[PDB]
Amino acid sequence: SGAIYVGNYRVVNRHLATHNDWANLVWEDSSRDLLVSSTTAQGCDTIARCDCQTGVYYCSSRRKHYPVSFSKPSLIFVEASEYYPARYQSHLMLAVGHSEPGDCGGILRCQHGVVGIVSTGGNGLVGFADVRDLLWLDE
Numbered sequence: 001s002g003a004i005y006v007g008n009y010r011v012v013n014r015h016l017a018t019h020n021d022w023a024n025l026v027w028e029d030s031s032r033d034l035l036v037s038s039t040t041a042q043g044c045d046t047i048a049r050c051d052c053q054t055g056v057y058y059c060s061s062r063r064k065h066y067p068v069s070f071s072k073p074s075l076i077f078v079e080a081s082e083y084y085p086a087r088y089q090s091h092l093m094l095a096v097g098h099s100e101p102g103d104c105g106g107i108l109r110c111q112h113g114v115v116g117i118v119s120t121g122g123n124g125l126v127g128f129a130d131v132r133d134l135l136w137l138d139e
């Protein structure tokens with residue numbers, strides 16, 4: 001679990017969104033595993049606007065932060081689950097690092113701010129849904 005609180009927005013994995021998130025929907029994209037809902041309180045986080053390929057992510061299944069090198073946001077094949085059929089997930093960045101299903105929502109950050117959230121994983125890899133292109137989160 002985990003979310004990005006920026007201004008009047010809450011960014012979550014679409015597959016973990018709540019009834020409240022869907023009742024206050026701003027935008028969602030199943031192909032990115034992202035959903036953005038509105039909030040009344042002002043958000044605590046800052047978003048990065050960069051092409052960084054190094055950062056640190058929070059891994060709840062180890063209660064630890066890990067430094068990672070990660071790929072550029074791209075279309076990557078993702079196996080079927082109770083949430084989605086087998087498909088290509090866009091804007092996904094892969095890194096070598098530990099992750100388990102409950103790790104989704106963990107934040108990835110670089111020196112410029114929040115880069116994205118854990119969305120996929122498997123066999124020593126971890127995938128992050130990028131949010132750096134969502135310029136409207138700031139305005």
Ligand SMILES: COc1cccc(Cl)c1CC(=O)N1CCC[C@H](C(N)=O)C1
Pocket residue numbers: 015033078081083084089099100101102103104118119120121122123
């Ligand atoms: C961090 O996720 C891990 C880690 C290790 C192993 C596994 Cl199966 C996962 C879970 C995972 O990749 N899923 C299930 C939830 C929907 C995801 C998606 N389509 O964006 C795909």
Ligand SMILES: [Zn+2]
Pocket residue numbers: 048049050051052110111112113
């Ligand atoms: Zn950066």
